[PDB]
């Protein structure tokens, strides 16, 4: 949750 | 994954 890988910014889910 | 919460930077596990 937040940054790199997941749900947030950059893998995964949200955005980047 | 990386940076805010879960294994990398900030909470949960690893550094900040």
Known sequence: ???XAXVXWXFXWXWX
Chains 1, 2 share one sequence.
Do not use: D, M, N
């Open 1 to 3: 949750v937040g940054a």
